[PDB]
């Protein structure tokens, strides 16, 4: 999730190379969410992609609510 942001959002200009690529990074995030939730009902911490506008600030917050997401590698 971090490397996606690094390579599609230019820090010193505060812009995504294209809204679509923001959506991309956003979607995979959602995915990582689902991978690590195991009860129904809990909503997403990324309810609107508006959040990824200033990404690096808010991304860390979402990645935070899913501890293990920093512990284990991508499921094949």
């Amino acid at each position: 999730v971090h490397r996606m942001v690094e390579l599609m959002y230019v820090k010193h200009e505060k812009r995504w190379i294209d809204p679509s690529l923001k959506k991309l990074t956003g979607d995979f995030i959602r995915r990582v969410e689902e991978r690590f939730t195991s009860v129904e009902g809990q909503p997403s911490l990324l309810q609107n992609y508006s959040d990824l506008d200033e990404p690096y600030p808010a991304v860390d917050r979402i990645l935070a609510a899913y501890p293990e997401a920093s512990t284990q590698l991508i499921n094949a």
Binding site: Q72, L73, N75, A76
Partner: protein, 48 residues
């Protein structure tokens, strides 16, 4: 297991503890790669 580890030093034990978790990540990668692609078993052809 704890009782074996009580033979060492926090030195050794905590150095082994790092090797272990590196393995667990190769093992984790393998298992998921193998479940999907049907290769939890790799038959060896040539000897070493």
């Amino acid at each position: 297991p704890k009782y074996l580890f009580a033979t060492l030093d926090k030195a050794q034990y905590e150095a082994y503890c790092v090797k272990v978790q590196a393995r667990q990540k190769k093992a984790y990668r393998f298992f998921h790669n193998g479940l999907i692609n049907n290769k939890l078993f790799v038959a060896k052809d040539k000897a070493p």
